[PDB]
């Protein structure tokens, strides 16, 4: 392998050529924001619950940014489920639903950002390259809206019109693209169980599991979007994720400190 070999292949073959694909894979790997952690604040699981859930997390974020650089993405939640129900009932396709869901993640980012503004933490577009706020001890964090950009170009699921890449995928891919050190999903359960804990009384807690193991037990579409598990297996930079309960005081803070709260889901 050489630049020369790569540049020659890049000029002379289709991008679909295996020989080109292989030469590209040997390229150097730059991490753009290696010291940042991406956190997703759930829409239905946290922000829709209002002050009792949101205020303690705002306090944790303010405290945590003293020691940790954070990119904080928002989920969507019940208003997006309502838009999806109306639009699916009209026969609209996944790409149209995708656009509708973005608006709800943006509302949630605005609400969280307004609670954080006096603390110096902005809502931004372009979180991964928010170079200035992330370089300042006075700031050290930004808020972003967690939907991906695909919108009308969203790939549909194999069945139905609900967009399969939503705010879990949006936040995950930002962590992956920017080469961040850690990805934490903040939800309303302690982590992953052997079945949905809201519905099953004797579900058993799982502290640590691989994607293959989850699939083998049918946990593909439980506490995370199933397509995220597949993105995770293909990821170059973020090869595990942690799922924690944001309703437990200090849980986010503890996860940022390296405590093994919640569930760790590994690519392999």
């Amino acid at each position: 392998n050489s630049t020369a070999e790569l540049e020659e292949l890049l000029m002379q073959r289709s991008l679909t050529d295996p020989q080109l694909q292989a030469a590209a894979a040997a390229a150097a790997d730059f991490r753009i924001l290696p010291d940042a952690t991406v956190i997703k604040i759930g829409g239905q699981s946290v922000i829709d619950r209002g002050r009792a859930a949101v205020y303690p997390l705002v306090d944790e974020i303010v405290a945590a940014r003293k020691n940790h650089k954070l990119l904080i993405g928002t989920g969507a939640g019940t208003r997006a489920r309502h838009l999806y129900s109306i639009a699916a009932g009209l026969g609209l396709p996944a790409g149209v639903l995708a656009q509708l869901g973005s608006s709800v993640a943006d509302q949630n980012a605005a609400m969280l950002g307004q609670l954080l503004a006096k603390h110096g933490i902005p809502v931004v577009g372009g979180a991964g390259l928010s170079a200035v706020p992330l370089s300042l001890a006075e700031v050290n964090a930004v808020v972003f809206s967690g939907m991906p950009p695909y919108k009308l170009w969203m790939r549909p699921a194999a069945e139905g019109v609900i967009p399969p890449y939503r705010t879990d995928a949006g936040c995950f891919l930002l962590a992956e693209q920017f080469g961040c050190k850690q990805m934490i999903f903040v939800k309303d359960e302690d982590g992953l169980y052997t079945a949905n804990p809201k519905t099953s009384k004797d579900a058993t807690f799982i502290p640590r599991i691989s994607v293959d193991e989850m699939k083998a037990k049918g946990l593909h579409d439980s506490i995370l979007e199933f397509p995220v598990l597949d993105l995770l297996q293909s990821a170059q930079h973020v090869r595990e994720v942690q799922v924690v309960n944001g309703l437990v005081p200090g849980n986010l803070t503890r996860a940022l400190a390296g405590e093994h709260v919640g569930t760790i889901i590994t690519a392999s």
């Binding site: 890049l10 150097a28 730059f30 996944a94 170009w153 969203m154 949006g170 891919l173 170059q236």
Partner: protein, 245 residues
């Protein structure tokens, strides 16, 4: 039921970036063919990227940049090709329109005028999927995602070759390359060699709801695009697997 068709009367045409790279010798006859098609069809014309994206990949990979960085950099070259093509059609009322306009206001723009041009790349950008260091969702894929989401009457891909062959007809093994008049996305998906279309195109064909076939035709031969837009078989037909309700 499958989702409704938004723009059932639309024809989508994707023009390969490597056709545009040939310059005036290829572009002027294509422009004259498109001019003659304006009264016949309601067209969304989408351009791919071509060789300048290979150069930005060379630089970006040498700088170590991840696949989500490379995606918008390639897309820019498809947008520039679209501005070039649209300028050549300006005197016929055709302009380039931006992605948000394509996504939300195509109906009004195709009421205002007979055709518009846009970039075929989809806005995956920094949220491009990981795995390969080369962005997977490229111009063929973007064009198909749009055509299928709109429930368009067709998508035609205009290439610098007659269609799909069993090997690259311009490569090392070109002597054993045999032309394929017809194929299915699933059969293509299981082969390993190079193709003139994105591999991701075959994946979005599998989840498609409306488009049943996509024809790949040689834009360097005048009249093939016109024939393909009438359903005539002049290149390679790719069956997506979608069937009528």
């Amino acid at each position: 039921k499958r989702p409704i068709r938004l723009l059932p009367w639309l024809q989508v045409v994707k023009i390969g970036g490597r056709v545009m790279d040939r310059g005036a010798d290829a572009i002027l006859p294509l422009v004259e063919e498109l001019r003659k098609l304006l009264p016949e069809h309601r067209l969304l014309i989408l351009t791919g990227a071509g060789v300048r994206a290979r150069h930005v990949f060379s630089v970006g990979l040498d700088l170590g940049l991840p696949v989500g960085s490379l995606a918008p950099l390639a897309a820019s070259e498809a947008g520039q090709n679209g501005h070039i093509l649209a300028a050549m059609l300006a005197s016929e009322g055709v302009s380039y329109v931006e992605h948000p306009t394509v996504a939300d206001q195509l109906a009004i723009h195709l009421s205002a005028t007979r055709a518009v041009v846009g970039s075929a790349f989809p806005p995956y950008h920094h949220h491009e999927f990981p795995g390969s260091r080369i962005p997977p969702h490229r111009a063929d894929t973007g064009a198909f995602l749009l055509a299928d989401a709109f429930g368009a009457a067709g998508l035609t891909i205009v290439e610098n070759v007659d269609g799909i062959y069993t090997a690259d007809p311009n490569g090392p093994d070109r002597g054993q390359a045999r032309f394929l008049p017809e194929t299915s996305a699933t059969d293509l998906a299981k082969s390993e060699g190079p193709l003139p279309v994105d591999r991701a195109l075959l994946d979005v064909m599998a989840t498609a709801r409306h488009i049943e076939r996509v024809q790949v035709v040689n834009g360097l031969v005048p009249g093939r695009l016109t024939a393909a837009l009438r359903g005539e078989h002049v290149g390679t037909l790719i069956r997506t697997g979608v069937r009528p309700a």
